[PDB]
Amino acid sequence: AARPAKYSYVDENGETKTWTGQGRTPAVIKKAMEEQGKQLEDFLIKELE
């Protein structure tokens, strides 16, 4: 078994942090959903079946 996260996001220089979908939505993911109209697939790195 493994846990290589589920999503990844940026701040300035490149990829900065990652997330699994557990708990409160990360601030950049939240702002992308609400102020850029995005969905999680823009940040997804593994599987979303």
Curated annotation (Swiss-Prot):
UniProt DNA-binding region: 22-27
Effect the entry attributes to changing residue 22 to A: Reduced DNA-binding, in fragment 91-137
Top-rank lineage group of the source organism: Bacteria
Localization of this protein: Cytoplasm, Nucleoid
Signal peptide (UniProt feature, chain positions): none
Disruption phenotype: Loss of osmotic regulation of the proU locus, loss of changes in plasmid linking number. 2X decreased growth rate, which is partially restored by a mutation preventing expression of SPI2, increased expression of about half of the genes to which H-NS binds. Note strain LT2 has point mutation in rpoS which decreases its translation efficiency, in the presence of wild-type rpoS, deletion of hns is lethal. Leads to the expression of genes encoding virulence proteins in normally non-inducing conditions.
Record function comment: Acts as a global transcriptional repressor and binds to the minor groove of AT-rich DNA. Silences genes by altering DNA topology; in magnesium concentrations equivalent to inside Salmonella-containing vacuoles (SCV) it forms rigid and elongated filaments on the DNA, and in higher magnesium conditions it causes DNA bridging/folding.
Family in the record: Belongs to the histone-like protein H-NS family.
Domain writeup: Composed of 2 domains (approximately residues 1-64 and 89-136) joined by a flexible linker. The isolated N-terminus (1-64) forms a trimer, probably via coiled-coil interactions. The isolated N-terminus plus linker fragment (residues 1-89) forms homooligomers of increasing size with increasing protein concentration, while the isolated C-terminus fragment is a monomer. A shorter fragment (residues 1-46) interacts with Hha.
Subunit structure: Forms oligomers of increasing size with increasing protein concentration. The fragment of 1-83 probably forms oligomers of 4 dimeric units at 10 degrees Celsius, at 40 degrees Celsius only dimers are formed. Binds Hha and YdgT (also known as cnu); crystal structures suggest each H-NS dimer could bind 2 Hha monomers on opposites sides. Probably also binds StpA.
Identification of the protein by name: DNA-binding protein H-NS
Naturally occurring in which organism (per UniProt): Salmonella typhimurium (strain LT2 / SGSC1412 / ATCC 700720)
Lineage: Bacteria, Pseudomonadati, Pseudomonadota, Gammaproteobacteria, Enterobacterales
Gene: hns
Location of this fragment in the whole protein: 91 to 137 of 137
